[PDB]
RNA sequence: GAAGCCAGAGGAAACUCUGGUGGAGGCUCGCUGACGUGCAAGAUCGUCAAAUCUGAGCAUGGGGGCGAAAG
């Protein structure tokens, strides 16, 4: 459900604790406190595979977002391209229970 | 359930063939083993699933037989694709040949087998065994029935004809249709004869190293040389395929005209008038003379055959290229004009003149007569250089025929003579004026020539009998026609 | 809006299996007489020689690429890791594969789940002689006992036979009426239509007009 | 069509003939009446074929005597006489109805004469 | 027939020659036995049977 | 002076007007003939030639007619 998956994404941005972008996603994985990792479809494969490797080592779930980077940024309420993002706190949304 | 556990195992095979096909070469044959379940349901979902995978997997190029690490991986996967697709077409054909009546909950196997065939025909054709795909379609199109699968097999073939540009797919289809029609001895539904009318052949800086730059230069010159060679070969191949299709199409046309199949030969003359300008120049006068021989044979129902060949001859000279070759190719339509004139008295007597976007294959005799007179009296070319005596000859006879003809036919003829007065005017105005009547000779009604009737020595009086005809559209027809007589 | 206008490591086919549990353990590993056979190769180089020589022309490379294969050719089918001695990760925010595949469009519309052909002009010449009262049946049979007779061609290799056929064509004359019959037999059905004859005459008339312009 | 429902034609034909005599309206019977004549039974070779033959001689008659004073009669009648002129040619070459053949001969001698006699007026 | 002549123009007969028979003005055609003899002489594989 | 950009005023919008920035162009400045189409008693449309200057090196093309081109 594309409409519903943007609903908790818009809530977790506006209620929870989220970092956006490649480098901040990397630092959140390194600290081990990340709880969900969203990766855009048009992310380059070397960036894609390095991010899948660290999430396996840090044991955090991943999600392959169907839309591209501009689509994920629009889902965030932001006006910039966001290829990768990480959830640190789910806030008041059911995006972590699912 | 039993039917449940197939659905994941159907989805098991198809999904990984979509992701990485070469990794798994027995899955085509694995799709075969899950297909002989005697329970009828999984026979249905497998046939659709085999249609699903081969649409996604089949490449855009044919693959040769092997004869005789990554190369051995590609060869095993590609040879497994052929053996799977050969087996699917066999199980498609024996499923379409199966018995049609079954439970009313759904159509049993056959229409699914046909809809799988028609989907493959417009998605596969380049790949091998297209003759096996088409032989399923031609077998249903020979059945001589109106049925949904008969209809479904029909738009599949004209979709193939309208879209194929290379011509190899069209040649194999028209070869089977031609061989079916002779084998059936021409008992086809004449929807498949109109399939020939649908043929189309007849009608931002990326860095590059120094070695990459030189390889891309040499690839450009190699592609440049290969471009003029491909253009010349594709043009020469297209003319050759058109030559073979035109031979098989016209041979079927002439064998129908010899066998005298009534419903088929209406469609043949439509195809003949459409495609005669593609064939050789010498054969154009032959077609105009074979039509003469047909008309003489009916002169030995029979009113429809003569009018069909008459409107076809006028439709041949209708065309632009044939019109400019009247002087060179000695194409005289004087036979068809004179035979049309001599049959107008007999045509009024025969009572089957009205029986309920083409040009020749019209159903009713009256509109065939109307299109013949439109060609004679209102031609698209040289409408002002028409012999007025020929105009006056038909004007009197069409007035006579309107007296003894059905109500709709009489209204149509008065509409036709209405157009002659508006277009020609002073040429035929003297017919209704009895003081301008010529005194050179007397009027011969029963004449065997258009020129010898002396039409300007008579006067038209059928308007007296037709302002009194029971249909007021006939009455309105005169009052419109006499309106333009006074408007000259 | 202007934005819209040897494989790597993946976690897709390793999720929820014992392989993930094994890899996540992180223990080290590394990857550690009758001449039949002589006749097979001699025909292989001869085919390779023929395809190489014929591919020097750009026309043949275009013809071969557009050439199809024959179903008469495809017949025959029916008709170590050196190891050391010591809830999914991918979540779809929603079997699902079986539900997804059969939610496709195609599954939803379906409810209730010997001929002798004279091509060469020389065979036409022999046909014109035989059909007319010029050469009888006795003369054709008797003159077939010549030096090109009783020569076998059955088991002979293709490189031997193709060399002979290039260099053993008998030299007997043809007639112009035999050659005329062959071209009119082999003429295509769209070779000479009204359209192409018209532009050919128009091209020739224009060519004379430019010559008169140049002489002007 | 056809011969089984032949008496249904003739009474129906007379009803149209009655209407055309009272009001001044043209009703074309020439196609229909000749078609009933040129069915299979007349051309296949007995009392009933004379009865249907003598009767249809009448229905040819009053159809032409209605508008026998209107000027367009050389052209109105002309398709009909030429139709029977072919019919005299086939019987000279069907049945053996010499009495029926002779009655139509007088009928086309009538129609030609009234066509001729009206051309001078 | 004109339809017959127009079929021979498209699908040429097997024994077709392009000549006119002196005896009958119809086009002169080779027989099946004659076509076999022409093949035997041209290829020269077997001069005579048995 | 073109797109494009900045600022202000109308209009729900698209757009409109003004003031600027910008510096695209088959734009300008210095000292017509041969044909084709024509469906009339010739109208109307299309094709062809007139093709950046210059040193040093270099390659190829030319006549007629027949034929649909290949020849």
From TrEMBL, chain A:
Residues 6-96 form the Ribosomal protein eL8/eL30/eS12/Gadd45 domain. One of its GO terms (molecular function) is RNA binding. GO terms for cellular component: cytosolic large ribosomal subunit. The keyword Ribonucleoprotein applies. InterPro entries: Ribosomal_eL30, Ribosomal_eL30-like, Ribosomal_eL30-like_sf, Ribosomal_eL30_CS, Ribosomal_eL8/eL30/eS12/Gad45. It holds the Pfam family Ribosomal_L7Ae. It comes from the Eukaryota. Keywords: Ribonucleoprotein, Ribosomal protein. Belongs to the eukaryotic ribosomal protein eL30 family. This is 60S ribosomal protein l30-like protein.
From TrEMBL, chain B:
Residues 306-476 form the CCAAT-binding factor domain. The keyword Kinase does not apply. GO terms for biological process: DNA replication initiation; ribosome biogenesis. The keyword Coiled coil applies. GO terms for cellular component: nucleolus. It comes from the Eukaryota. Residues 208-239 form a coiled coil. Required for synthesis of 60S ribosomal subunits and the transport of pre-ribosomes from the nucleoplasm to the cytoplasm. Belongs to the CBF/MAK21 family. This is Nucleolar complex-associated protein 3. It comes from Chaetomium thermophilum (strain DSM 1495 / CBS 144.50 / IMI 039719).
Automatic annotation (TrEMBL), chain C:
It comes from the Eukaryota. Belongs to the class I-like SAM-binding methyltransferase superfamily. RNA methyltransferase RlmE family. SPB1 subfamily. This is Uncharacterized protein. It is found in: Nucleus, Nucleolus. The lineage of its organism: Eukaryota, Fungi, Dikarya, Ascomycota, Pezizomycotina. The chain holds residues 394 to 752 of 834 of the full protein. Residues 37-68 have a biased composition (Basic and acidic residues). Transmembrane segments: none annotated.
TrEMBL record, chain D:
Coiled coil: none annotated. Belongs to the NOC2 family. This is Putative NOC2 family protein. It comes from the Eukaryota. It is found in: Nucleus.
């Amino acid at each position: 459900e594309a409409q519903s998956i943007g609903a908790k994404l818009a809530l977790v941005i506006k209620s929870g604790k989220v970092v956006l972008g490649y480098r901040s996603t990397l630092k959140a994985l390194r600290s081990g406190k990340a709880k969900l990792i969203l990766i855009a479809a048009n992310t380059p494969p070397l960036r894609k595979s390095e991010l899948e490797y660290y999430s396996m080592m840090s044991k955090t779930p991943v999600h392959h977002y169907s839309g591209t980077n501009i689509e994920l940024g629009t889902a965030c309420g932001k006006l910039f391209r966001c290829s990768t993002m990480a959830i640190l706190d789910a806030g008041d949304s059911d995006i972590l229970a699912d | 359930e039993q039917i449940r556990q197939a659905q994941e195992e159907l989805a098991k095979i198809a999904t990984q063939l979509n992701e990485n096909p070469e990794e798994y070469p027995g899955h085509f044959k694995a799709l075969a083993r899950i297909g002989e379940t005697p329970i009828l349901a999984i026979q249905k979902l497998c046939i659709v699933t085999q249609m699903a995978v081969y649409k996604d997997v089949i490449p855009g190029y044919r693959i040769r037989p092997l004869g005789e690490k990554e190369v051995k991986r590609l060869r095993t996967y590609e040879q497994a694709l052929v053996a799977g697709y050969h087996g699917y077409l066999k199980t498609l054909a024996t499923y379409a040949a199966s018995s049609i009546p079954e439970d009313r909950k759904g159509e049993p196997i056959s229409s699914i087998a046909f809809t799988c065939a028609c989907e493959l025909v417009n998605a596969v054709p380049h790949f091998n065994f297209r003759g096996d795909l088409l032989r399923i379609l031609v077998k249903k199109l020979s059945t001589r029935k109106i049925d949904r699968d008969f209809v479904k097999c029909r738009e599949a073939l004209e979709k193939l004809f309208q879209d194929d540009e290379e011509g190899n797919a069209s040649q194999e289809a028209v070869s089977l249709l031609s061989k079916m029609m002779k084998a059936r001895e021409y008992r086809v539904d004449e929807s498949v004869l109109n399939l020939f009318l649908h043929l189309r052949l007849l009608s931002k800086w990326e860095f590059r190293t120094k070695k990459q730059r030189k390889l891309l230069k040499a690839e450009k010159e190699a592609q440049k040389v290969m471009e003029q060679a491909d253009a010349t070969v594709s043009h020469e191949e297209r003319e050759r395929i058109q030559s073979e299709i035109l031979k098989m199409v016209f041979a079927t046309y002439f064998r129908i005209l010899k066998a005298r199949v009534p419903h088929l030969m209406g469609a043949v003359l439509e195809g003949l008038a459409k495609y005669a300008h593609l064939i050789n120049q010498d054969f154009f006068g032959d077609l105009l003379e074979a039509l003469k021989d047909l008309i003489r044979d009916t002169d030995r129902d029979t009113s429809r055959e003569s009018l069909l060949c008459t409107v076809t001859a006028f439709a041949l000279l209708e065309g632009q290229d044939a019109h400019n070759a009247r002087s060179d190719l000695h194409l005289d339509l004087s036979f068809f004009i004179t035979n049309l004139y001599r049959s107008l008295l007999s045509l009024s007597l025969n009572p089957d003149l009205e029986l309920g976007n083409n040009k020749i294959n019209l159903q009713t005799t009256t509109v065939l007569l109307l299109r013949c007179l439109t060609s004679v009296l209102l031609p698209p070319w040289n409408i002002r250089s028409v012999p007025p005596i020929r105009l006056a000859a038909f004007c009197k006879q069409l007035m006579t025929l309107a007296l003894q003809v059905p109500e709709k036919s009489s209204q149509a003829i008065l509409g036709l003579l209405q157009d002659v007065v508006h277009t020609h005017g002073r040429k035929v105005a003297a017919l209704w004026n009895t003081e301008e009547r010529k005194g050179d000779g007397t009027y011969k009604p029963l004449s065997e020539t258009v020129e010898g009737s002396n039409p300007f020595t008579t006067t038209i009086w059928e308007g007296e009998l037709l302002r009194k005809h029971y249909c007021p559209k006939v009455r309105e027809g005169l009052k419109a026609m006499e309106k333009e007589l006074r408007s000259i | 809006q202007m934005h819209m206008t040897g494989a790597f490591f993946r976690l897709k086919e390793i999720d929820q299996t014992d392989a993930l549990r094994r890899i996540a353990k992180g223990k080290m590993a590394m990857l550690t007489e009758d001449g039949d056979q002589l006749e097979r190769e001699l025909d292989a180089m001869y085919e390779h020689y023929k395809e190489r020589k014929a591919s020097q022309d750009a026309k043949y490379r275009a013809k071969r690429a557009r050439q199809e294969v024959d179903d008469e050719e495809w017949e025959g089918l029916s008709a170590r890791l050196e190891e050391d001695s010591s809830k999914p990760l991918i979540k779809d925010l929603s079997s699902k594969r079986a539900r997804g595949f059969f939610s496709q469009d195609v599954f939803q519309k379906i409810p209730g789940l010997p001929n002798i052909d004279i091509i060469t002009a020389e065979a036409m010449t022999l046909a014109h002689q035989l059909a007319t009262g010029e050469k009888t049946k006795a003369d054709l049979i008797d003159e077939g006992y010549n030096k090109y007779a009783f020569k076998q061609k059955e088991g002979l290799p293709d490189w031997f036979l193709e060399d002979e056929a290039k260099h053993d064509k008998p030299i007997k004359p043809i007639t112009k009426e035999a050659a005329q019959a062959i071209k009119e037999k082999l003429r295509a059905l769209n070779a000479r239509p009204i359209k192409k004859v018209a532009e050919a005459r128009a091209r020739r008339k224009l060519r004379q007009a430019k010559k008169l312009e140049k002489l002007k | 069509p056809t011969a089984i429902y032949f008496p249904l034609r003739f009474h129906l034909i007379r009803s149209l003939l009655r209407l055309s005599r009272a009001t001044d309206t043209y009703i074309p019977l020439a196609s229909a009446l000749l078609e009933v004549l040129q069915s299979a039974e007349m051309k296949k070779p007995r009392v009933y074929q004379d009865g249907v033959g003598e009767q249809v001689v009448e229905l040819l008659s009053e159809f032409f005597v209605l508008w026998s004073r209107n000027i367009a009669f050389p052209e109105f009648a002309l398709p009909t006489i030429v139709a029977l002129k072919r019919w005299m040619k086939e019987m000279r070459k069907g049945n053996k109805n010499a009495k029926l053949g002779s009655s139509l001969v007088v009928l086309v001698q009538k129609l030609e004469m009234n066509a001729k006699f009206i051309e001078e007026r | 027939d004109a339809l017959q002549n127009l079929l021979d123009s498209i699908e040429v007969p097997e024994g077709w020659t392009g000549l006119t028979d002196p005896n009958t003005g119809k086009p002169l055609n080779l027989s099946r036995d004659e076509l076999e003899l022409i093949r035997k002489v041209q290829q020269g594989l077997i001069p005579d049977d048995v």
